[PDB]
Amino acid sequence: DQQLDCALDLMRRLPPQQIEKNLSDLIDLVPSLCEDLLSSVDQPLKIARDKVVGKDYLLCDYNRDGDSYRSPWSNKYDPPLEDGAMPSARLRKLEVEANNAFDQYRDLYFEGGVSSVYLWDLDHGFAGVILIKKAGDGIKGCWDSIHVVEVQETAHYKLTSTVMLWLQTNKTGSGTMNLGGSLTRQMEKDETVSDSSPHIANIGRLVEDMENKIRSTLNEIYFGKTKDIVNGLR
């Protein structure tokens, strides 16, 4: 309603680096908006540790059941759950292949960070989320990407992607410079499915094209605009 529109507008104006605090203060302010706010606002990704296989994974609502979260590596919930929601045996097999595929994608484009892939069934076809988080080592910053894909079964693919990206430098001439923000894009197309062009190859090419175009847009259109604005202020 009107309050939700005000809350979403507020989230678009407040400093993007403090989105978690602003979201928490917002829900503290109007508790009834909690479910709608969390359904409409993407948050920076949080890392959890799969203590069984010794690997990091990313948390979101798609791999949550109650207060537990499902690891993409072990297919187990932490804290353990008796009957936690699980993908079908067939989807789990594609989920394992997708996590292996996107871990290499993450390694080649990010040279670090953490990735996680979760898939779930739909009435006709399936959907999934691809999550990537890469922080800087040490100037500093963080990249968070959330790709939501829907596969309608030659299949139709729909991709909704959000990238959250902040960067800070501390230098002698320019002092402290902080750039933060986000971009949300969408792409859809039809692709033939076969042994040589499987679902994950189709999804990977879509995610690869999306992140490359979003990265170029963040660099050229958005960051370059703030530089022009600064040169116009004085």
């Binding site: 949080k46 109650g66 207060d67 929601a85 779930w120 829907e150 729909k158």
Partner: peptide, 19 residues
């Protein structure tokens, strides 16, 4: 702007923040 797909099913509870 086309709609996102529905999330997973299974009565998984309400959305919440992560500390």
């Amino acid at each position: 702007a086309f709609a996102k797909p529905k999330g997973p099913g299974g009565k998984r509870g309400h959305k919440r923040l992560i500390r």
